[model samples]
Target chain A: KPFSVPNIPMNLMSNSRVPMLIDGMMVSNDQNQVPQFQNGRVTLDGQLQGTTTVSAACIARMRGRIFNNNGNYGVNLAELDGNPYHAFDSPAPLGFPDFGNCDLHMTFVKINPTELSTGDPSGKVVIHSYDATFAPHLGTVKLEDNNELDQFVGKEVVLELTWVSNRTGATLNLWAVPNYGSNLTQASQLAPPIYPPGFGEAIVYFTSTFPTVSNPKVPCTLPQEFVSHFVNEQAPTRGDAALLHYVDPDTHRNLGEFKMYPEGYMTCVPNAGGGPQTLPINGVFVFISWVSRYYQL
Target chain B: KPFSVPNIPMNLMSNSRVPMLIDGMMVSNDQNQVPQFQNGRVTLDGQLQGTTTVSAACIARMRGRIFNNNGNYGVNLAELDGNPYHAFDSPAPLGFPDFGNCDLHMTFVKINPTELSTGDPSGKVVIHSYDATFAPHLGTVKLEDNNELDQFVGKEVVLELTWVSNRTGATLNLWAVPNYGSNLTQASQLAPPIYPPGFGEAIVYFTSTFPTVSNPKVPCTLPQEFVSHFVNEQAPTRGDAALLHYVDPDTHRNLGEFKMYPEGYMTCVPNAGGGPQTLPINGVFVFISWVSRYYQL
Candidate 1:
């Protein structure tokens, strides 16, 4: 047997408020051939009051934790674009036109003394400021909230986004978010074929030079920091020589370091009267006394 | 070059399901003069089964910090509207015609065991709350998650908005947010802020009176707790000065204190013709044998 057709009804609320537009003029509610947002048959959930503008996008609050993804984070709203119907797409950021700064209309405010729940007599709980990092397009939101300056320290906070237009950018399927509830650094090193396998003047070990040209491979020391993160793009090249030491884990910050042993600097056969051979490989020294290298990325 | 037009096929998936409502009639598919959402015009992403309802808003989990936006926070979906195509603008919170409160058809449900994430989690992360502040037009949602009673804590929980009347607000950015991995207070303070600052009393240094106008300003000490928020709208200026306080920040807290002193009081030149001229200024005498005096905002 086949599926039977269902019966239909007669009366639907009148479409009085609007009738599609051409520049701004109202046209027939039946003019559909060229496609108009008006003069068309509405959907089952289409009886919107002609009195107010519809929601332009999705907005809500999360009284959870501010994040720090190895130092990468934001509300990342673009990920929530889940409208089941569309002919095109684009994203509006921070709920603003994303044009000029200083002239921005939308801003995310982080309240100070950041306490979650409602009544906590300790403070009145007011808006603190719009994140400085996000004030411009150059940087993203620094979601690391548990820091000392963080009012919400180890506590929960609320996040709000605003978009007033009749649209939906929601991800469906269920779960809990707001009910309104509530980091480290490391370094590593390498073992060189030559060196007094022991600790040295902390700063001295950080200032050594490695044998350039001849290939320096595994068994070399790189901070555990370097090993922890997968910056494959910065992987050591086979055409390179000597393992280098750094002042910090990020290669960009290493060049500023001093000298040391194999754990911190590896060796190989030096090439011709080589001037500064260029390379972007990252390596670290193992042992040193007052060693002061750090990792950042 | 002259602008070129793109071609569209004539036989796209035959519009299934609905028809325009005349008498709730299903007329000719070629009735282009008046449009219908049927017979395949596809909503940008049509993964929906259409058994329940379709998405009409934006949704995303804030792996960023669970901001404590001054107690003034919301997902504010209405701010995200840059819909180049709209006749008017206004926010229709919850999307389903905001009618009677008790009879509301929209509801936001946060999943159980709330775990704030930075990026998406390892399980299918979803939404879960509708905001209690928004539950009632005079109504609202009781979006309270786990409070030591919830078993979902440390586990996976999903937040779902029911209107399937079904898009299942599930995030599809290719990550799991529900492995229930990782890391609240009962609320004290109202207990009176005076039990010695050693963690003996559940709360300390809470209540302090607000000063009336004698020539206010230039001298006052509200708590970092008090000054950080707004409670001035609640400034009772009938003329009384014993140093009273407690405003919800936004409720209109006060504006006092000289600068940012660590956490204590300053000395004041108290007055009274017979008692000590007649004004009271707040100042903490440094290092008293048993010093006592805190800031109030």
Candidate 2:
């Protein structure tokens, strides 16, 4: 036969660690006392240094395996801090203490509805600029607290989010402004601005579903069908560009900003499948982008 | 204070795995002989069943972490087998023994070049259908000392591939037809068809770079600049749809066909960064979609 599986199945004995050879020389050196290869190839059953650089090519190719082939979701940024296996340091320190005052602002030029009919929004005229603002805090804020700055309560934020349609490449863009009240009950005041192509339907669906005067922190309360539209799509595909400006919560002054890119898509959430399946827009995003100092871009 | 990091730091030591209690009840369970949680959340050091299901929402949110926070690439489909930690089963069995004969065929409706000026291909009308065919084999093939049908060699294939531009959302569509020779030293037969929007420059770059007739199996031989284009972008983003047909290589008869989806982007390559870094399109794709039975529509 020209080609067939080389079934070289044989058990090994008295092994500390063995290396594979082609011709005669070793392929690569073992990093630790433990063996890390199977059948002349590196195995995934070992640890790696955190700062170890993976080729940009490798990262792009395996991007869809967010939840590995075995279905186990990868670890989050917080876990990377203490894990001995993950020795890489973040660009900045993490935790709520570090996220003193942070605000998110988005600026986009409105494309007239007339331009979307052509199926391409690139040539659409820019009618006006719109800014959507959100201030998501972490930890607890007490009204009666003595300190002056200790008034903002811990609120969730959103980092990377994706939804896709199998038949049509439909997408949804959602941003929320949390209500500030004792019970935290009230409909968010959503500034309906910066609607991109394919998002016309999604905005209407979101505004109609979110309760006006209700607790936004509750999980699994949104319509199951609606929640599925945001979270149940296949792969989290790449997103379009947007002007994301970061600002100081107190002064509302731009500290720094960037044109959003793929950096934001690299985030994780707690396993939300076992229970009512609360939306992942809360604690997950807050820690990755807002509270934690892991946001690279 | 309005918000402060909740610094609830304490040490815990127990004989067995204990669940985190919020208010009163436990959050989740300890799967087996190990505790899966640290503090009030799940820990990553423990093992998980292969069949465990991750929420679609979680997948999209974490889609950019192919190498994960620890910089370790996820396991391949082949390793998923026999890994007790990974309990999921493939739709089909694996190995060269099973892949007796298989071929891949792609049909795409070409768009006229004059329409690419608008920065969107959705408006481009279909010019004509183009078919790109490839027959990638695995294992070893002997030309003269083989049976009647044992003529094809075990060539590599590609699976999910992604490359992104941080500045512009530029993309390149590439397909190659392998050469058949005893030395495997010849230029590939590339059909330059179906150049999508933003690919005009890439086509010129690729055609001018690949050697006319050379050893195709060697790694790191391609120019670093060109290899970077295919593998070094960012995340493996979702690809556009195409009409893909499965055929019997020997008979060239159509067995089935399907419009492509995000399912194909789910693949991995061996750590190619170790040496000069060959492109990832070969061994990774061949096993995930061609030889192994993991391709899901």
**Tens-digit lDDT string for candidate 1 (A1-297):** 111100100000011111100011111122121211111111112221101111112122212234445554333222111112111121112111211111111113222222211222111121111234432122123343323324433332333321111102322101111110010111011011223222221211111110010110101122111211111112222221222333233432443223222122222222213536532222322222222222110
| TM-score of each candidate structure, all chains considered together | 0.16, 0.15
Runs of candidate 2 with Cα error greater than 4 angstroms are A1-55, A58-85, A91-297, B1-220, B223-297
lDDT of 1 by residue, B117-143 (tens): 112222211222233344212211222
Interface RMSD of 2: 26.7
Q: Backbone collision count in every prediction?
A: 146, 20
| Model 2 C-alpha lDDT per residue in residues B1-297, reported as the tens digit of each score | 011111111011000011000111111121121211111111111111111111111110000001111321211122111112211132111111111111111011102223222221211111100112111111112211112111111111111100101112311111221221113222122111222122111111111111011111111111111111221112232334223333343443443332322221111222324445432111100111222222333
Off by over 4 Å in 1: A1-55, A59-132, A146-159, A162-297, B1-297
What 10-residue stretch in candidate 1 chain A is worst by lDDT?
A4-13
Q: How much lDDT does candidate 2 score? A: 0.16
